[PDB]
C-alpha cells in the first residue's frame, strides 16, 4: 500500500543479536521485539562514509515498497547509533541450493526424503511468481540462482540473499575480463560479452534455476571449466534435460535460452505454465530433513 513507501524505523533495544552468520558489512541472526518476539536476519553497516550511509537509506527506500509473497520480507532499519542495521525475516530452512542438495539421491543414500517432481514444480512456480513481480517493478536482479533463494515452512520459497554468495559460493563466480566477479554459468551471451543485464537476462537465469531444481542443486555445466562454459553459451550448446524434468518444463527452459534476448519466453507466460503444472501435481507427501 501507499504507507509502505515510507521506511519503518526500529528501536536499537528491540534487536537482540544472536549469531554472526558471515560478512557492506556483517550479517546476523537476531530476535526482534515489538514488530509482530520473532527471529530476524540482519545486515549491519559499521562506521561508514556520508555517501555509504546515503546509499544505505537509498536501499532501504527501494526495499520498503518492493513487497511480494515471494520476495524476502524487509521489516525496516535501525539508525540509532553505530552500526546501522537493516532488518529482514528469518527463513527457517536457509538457502535453496543447500535445501535441494540435502534432499538429493546422494544425501538419501549417504534419512531425508528425496525431493519429488511435484515438490520441484511447487518450488519453481514460486520463484517465477517472484520474478513476475520484480519485472513489473522494472527491477533487474543480475544474480538469480538457487543459492540466492530462501526456504521457509510448508515448502514456502522466496527470492532473497544477504550479500554473502560471492564468498560462500566462490566457485559459482568468474573474473570476467579480469575485472568483475560474475555468475557466468547462469548468464546469457550478451551479459558475459557486453555486461548487458536486463529482464531478458534474468529470464535466461530462471531457465538455469529450473535446471538446478530438477537436478537437486547440481552446479550447471559441472563437467566444464569456466572457459568451456563461455564457449558453450556463446556457440549455442545447451544444458542436458534433467532425468526428473517433464518435457514441457525442458521446452520452457529452451525458450529461456534463446540467443536473442527479445526472442526469449516472457516471464508472465513462464509463471502461468509453471502455476498450472504445479496445481495439476500438488504437494501432499511428508518431507523429512
UniProtKB/Swiss-Prot annotation:
Q: What are the positions of the active site? A: 143
Chain positions recorded as ATP binding sites: 21-27, 43
Q: Where is this site: Interaction with PLCG1?
A: 284
> Could you state what the record's PTM comment says about this protein?
Phosphorylated. Undergoes ligand-mediated autophosphorylation that is required for interaction with SHC1 and PLCG1 and other downstream effectors. Isoform TrkB-T-Shc is not phosphorylated. Ubiquitinated. Undergoes polyubiquitination upon activation; regulated by NGFR. Ubiquitination regulates the internalization of the receptor.
Q: Where does the record place the modification Phosphotyrosine?
A: 169, 173-174, 284
- Tell me the ranges covered by the Protein kinase domain, including all copies: 15-274
Q: Report the subcellular localization.
A: Cell membrane; Endosome membrane; Early endosome membrane; Cell projection, Axon
Site Interaction with SH2D1A: give positions: 173
Q: What is the effect of changing residue 173 to C?
A: In OBHD; expressed normally on the cell surface; results in markedly impaired ligand-induced phosphorylation as well as impaired downstream MAPK1 phosphorylation
What ranges are annotated Cytoplasmic (topological domains)? Answer: 4-289
Question: What is the annotated tissue distribution of the protein whose record heads this document?
Answer: Isoform TrkB is expressed in the central and peripheral nervous system. In the central nervous system (CNS), expression is observed in the cerebral cortex, hippocampus, thalamus, choroid plexus, granular layer of the cerebellum, brain stem, and spinal cord. In the peripheral nervous system, it is expressed in many cranial ganglia, the ophthalmic nerve, the vestibular system, multiple facial structures, the submaxillary glands, and dorsal root ganglia. Isoform TrkB-T1 is mainly expressed in the brain but also detected in other tissues including pancreas, kidney and heart.
Q: How does it assemble?
A: Exists in a dynamic equilibrium between monomeric (low affinity) and dimeric (high affinity) structures. Interacts (phosphorylated upon activation by BDNF) with SHC1; mediates SHC1 phosphorylation and activation. Interacts (phosphorylated upon activation by BDNF) with PLCG1 and/or PLCG2; mediates PLCG1 phosphorylation and activation. Interacts with SH2B1 and SH2B2. Interacts with NGFR; may regulate the ligand specificity of the receptor. Interacts with SORCS2; this interaction is important for normal targeting to post-synaptic densities in response to high-frequency stimulation.
Q: What does this protein do?
A: Receptor tyrosine kinase involved in the development and the maturation of the central and the peripheral nervous systems through regulation of neuron survival, proliferation, migration, differentiation, and synapse formation and plasticity. Receptor for BDNF/brain-derived neurotrophic factor and NTF4/neurotrophin-4. Alternatively can also bind NTF3/neurotrophin-3 which is less efficient in activating the receptor but regulates neuron survival through NTRK2. Upon ligand-binding, undergoes homodimerization, autophosphorylation and activation.
Q: What disease is this protein tied to?
A: Developmental and epileptic encephalopathy 58: A form of epileptic encephalopathy, a heterogeneous group of severe early-onset epilepsies characterized by refractory seizures, neurodevelopmental impairment, and poor prognosis. Development is normal prior to seizure onset, after which cognitive and motor delays become apparent. DEE58 is an autosomal dominant condition characterized by onset of refractory seizures in the first days or months of life.
Family (UniProt): Belongs to the protein kinase superfamily. Tyr protein kinase family. Insulin receptor subfamily.
**Leftover remarks:** Trk also stands for tropomyosin-related kinase since the first Trk was isolated as an oncogenic protein which was the result of a fusion between the tropomyosin gene TPM3 and NTRK1.
Specify the protein name. BDNF/NT-3 growth factors receptor
Q: Give the gene that encodes this protein.
A: NTRK2
Q: Note the residue range shown relative to the complete protein.
A: 527 to 822 of 822
